[PDB]
Enzyme design. Structure first.
Site, PDB file in Angstrom:
ATOM      1  CG  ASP A 126      29.632  49.276  -2.368  1.00  0.00           C
ATOM      2  OD1 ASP A 126      30.694  49.952  -2.428  1.00  0.00           O
ATOM      3  OD2 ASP A 126      29.608  48.025  -2.196  1.00  0.00           O
ATOM      4  CD  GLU A 168      35.995  49.767  -2.579  1.00  0.00           C
ATOM      5  OE1 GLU A 168      35.276  49.131  -3.305  1.00  0.00           O
ATOM      6  OE2 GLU A 168      35.862  49.747  -1.286  1.00  0.00           O
ATOM      7  CD  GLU A 169      33.153  46.899  -4.308  1.00  0.00           C
ATOM      8  OE1 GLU A 169      33.658  46.018  -3.548  1.00  0.00           O
ATOM      9  OE2 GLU A 169      32.164  47.569  -4.028  1.00  0.00           O
ATOM     10  CG  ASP A 215      32.694  52.919   0.337  1.00  0.00           C
ATOM     11  OD1 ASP A 215      31.706  52.646  -0.394  1.00  0.00           O
ATOM     12  OD2 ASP A 215      33.756  52.281   0.317  1.00  0.00           O
ATOM     13  CG  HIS A 297      29.304  43.556  -1.660  1.00  0.00           C
ATOM     14  ND1 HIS A 297      30.569  43.048  -1.539  1.00  0.00           N
ATOM     15  CD2 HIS A 297      29.452  44.860  -1.994  1.00  0.00           C
ATOM     16  CE1 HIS A 297      31.465  44.018  -1.730  1.00  0.00           C
ATOM     17  NE2 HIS A 297      30.813  45.141  -2.003  1.00  0.00           N
TER      18      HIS A 297
HETATM   19  C1  LIG Z   1      34.704  49.388   1.563  1.00  0.00           C
HETATM   20  N1  LIG Z   1      33.815  48.435   0.781  1.00  0.00           N
HETATM   21  C2  LIG Z   1      32.996  48.755  -0.233  1.00  0.00           C
HETATM   22  N2  LIG Z   1      32.380  47.658  -0.606  1.00  0.00           N
HETATM   23  N3  LIG Z   1      32.783  46.620   0.148  1.00  0.00           N
HETATM   24  C3  LIG Z   1      33.656  47.129   1.032  1.00  0.00           C
HETATM   25  C4  LIG Z   1      34.380  46.362   2.143  1.00  0.00           C
HETATM   26  C5  LIG Z   1      35.860  46.366   1.840  1.00  0.00           C
HETATM   27  C6  LIG Z   1      36.628  45.489   2.820  1.00  0.00           C
HETATM   28  N4  LIG Z   1      36.086  44.169   2.896  1.00  0.00           N
HETATM   29  C7  LIG Z   1      36.893  43.076   3.100  1.00  0.00           C
HETATM   30  N5  LIG Z   1      37.937  43.248   3.908  1.00  0.00           N
HETATM   31  C8  LIG Z   1      38.827  42.214   4.204  1.00  0.00           C
HETATM   32  C9  LIG Z   1      38.601  40.934   3.679  1.00  0.00           C
HETATM   33  C10 LIG Z   1      37.484  40.717   2.840  1.00  0.00           C
HETATM   34  C11 LIG Z   1      36.620  41.793   2.544  1.00  0.00           C
HETATM   35  C12 LIG Z   1      35.615  41.584   1.586  1.00  0.00           C
HETATM   36  C13 LIG Z   1      35.655  42.471   0.473  1.00  0.00           C
HETATM   37  C14 LIG Z   1      34.794  42.375  -0.591  1.00  0.00           C
HETATM   38  C15 LIG Z   1      33.890  41.376  -0.593  1.00  0.00           C
HETATM   39  F1  LIG Z   1      33.068  41.314  -1.647  1.00  0.00           F
HETATM   40  N6  LIG Z   1      33.805  40.471   0.440  1.00  0.00           N
HETATM   41  C16 LIG Z   1      34.687  40.556   1.547  1.00  0.00           C
HETATM   42  C17 LIG Z   1      34.641  44.176   3.237  1.00  0.00           C
HETATM   43  C18 LIG Z   1      33.905  44.968   2.190  1.00  0.00           C
HETATM   44 ZN   LIG Z   2      31.325  47.142  -2.249  1.00  0.00          ZN
END
Ligand SMILES: Cn1cnnc1C1CCN(c2ncccc2-c2ccc(F)nc2)CC1
Ligand SMILES: [Zn+2]
EC number: 2.3.2.5
Length: 328
Positions: A126, A168-169, A215, A297
């Site tokens: 990631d 991105e994060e 990703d 994460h």
């Molecule tokens: C695409 N990616 C890369 N690393 N984490 C992600 C996803 C991105 C979208 N995400 C979310 N979408 C909607 C609401 C909350 C989240 C989310 C994002 C980051 C995080 F740390 N916790 C929840 C889940 C993680």
């Molecule tokens: Zn991430």
């Protein structure tokens, strides 16, 4: 003209068995590992020393190649939950004035977390592995990509671009304004920018044939859903390439029952760097697994928890895909 619709009729030039063997033999997972991946396994959130070091590393690795890559750094400021920060997207382009590009992309930032134990988040899946996969693809195909430098009226006006997004994060709570800093910026800039230069109407987004966004790759036994009907035919090419490389004995530790590229779709909407492109009508092939890696994460998203054979396998499939797309 009608050139922005060419992507809708574009077909692959499918490789034969002996070319598939050559591509499989021409990529080195150990060279990627040491030379492309290990230097990125550092904390690299926006403005950290690792952010600058990541950027220098990606740029130096492209610059040593023979193909005529043009590097640009798309740097801007934005408010964040931590206060104003600087973000830098890295764009690497073959044939920048070609009307069309196939675009491969990933994010090179790492999410910010406080140091639990003596441990730091390095986001191996990631997305340090995606970054390294893009760099290995550029190295492994370098001789073939060098031929795009040759002008010719017998070939569509189509070349390759790599995008390494910053920011991105989310910094605090994922939301519309806290996430996707680099990609929201770059999609807006591209939408505003004429392409080709001097054109009426058409922007740089009309030039994006297909955005292939990698990703969360590197875990064992990934399962990629076929997310979008307007890229489903390209997804089915990845399935076909996977199947043929399997059958030819060119994948490692791979079974047809544990294949990566799946028939089914996904019931929700995953937010990622493709969103600001997709909402403006760019076609997207989102190569993100569902479910996400078990380690997502956590501090265990690290080198130890990556799967060498899986990444090697995916390298071969992606490289074949790109050559077929570009008719190389
Ligand atoms: C695409 N990616 C890369 N690393 N984490 C992600 C996803 C991105 C979208 N995400 C979310 N979408 C909607 C609401 C909350 C989240 C989310 C994002 C980051 C995080 F740390 N916790 C929840 C889940 C993680
Ligand atoms: Zn991430």
């Amino acid at each position: 003209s009608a050139w922005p619709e060419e992507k809708n009729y574009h077909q692959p030039a499918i490789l034969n068995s002996s070319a598939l063997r050559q591509i499989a033999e021409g990529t080195s997972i150990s060279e990627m590992w040491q030379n492309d991946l290990q230097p990125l396994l550092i904390e690299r959130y926006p403005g950290s020393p690792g952010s600058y070091a990541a950027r220098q590393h990606i740029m130096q690795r492209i610059q040593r190649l023979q193909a005529d890559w043009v590097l640009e750094i798309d740097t801007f400021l934005s408010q964040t939950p931590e206060g104003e920060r600087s973000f830098s997207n890295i764009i690497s382009t073959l044939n920048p004035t070609a009307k069309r590009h196939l675009v491969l992309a990933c994010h090179y930032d790492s999410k910010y977390f406080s140091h639990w134990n003596n441990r730091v988040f390095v986001g191996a899946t990631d997305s340090a592995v995606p970054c390294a996969m893009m760099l290995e693809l550029a190295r492994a195909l370098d001789k073939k990509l060098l031929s795009l430098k040759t002008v010719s009226d017998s070939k569509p006006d189509l070349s390759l671009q790599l995008i390494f997004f910053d920011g991105e994060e989310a910094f605090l709570h994922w939301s519309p304004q806290d996430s996707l800093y680099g990609s929201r910026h770059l999609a807006a800039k591209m939408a505003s920018t004429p392409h080709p230069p001097g054109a009426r109407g058409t922007s740089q987004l009309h030039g994006m044939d297909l955005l292939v966004l990698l990703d969360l790759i590197g875990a064992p036994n990934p399962t990629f859903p076929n997310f979008f009907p307007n890229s489903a035919r390209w997804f089915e090419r990845l399935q076909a390439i996977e199947h043929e490389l399997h059958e030819l004995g060119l994948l490692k530790d791979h079974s047809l029952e544990g294949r990566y590229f799946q028939n089914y779709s996904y019931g929700g909407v995953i937010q990622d760097d493709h969103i600001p492109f997709l909402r403006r009508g760019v076609p997207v092939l989102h190569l993100i697994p569902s479910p996400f890696p078990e380690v997502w994460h956590t501090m265990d998203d690290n080198e130890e928890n990556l799967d060498e054979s899986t990444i090697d396998n995916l390298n071969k499939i992606l490289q074949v895909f790109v050559l077929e797309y570009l008719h190389l």
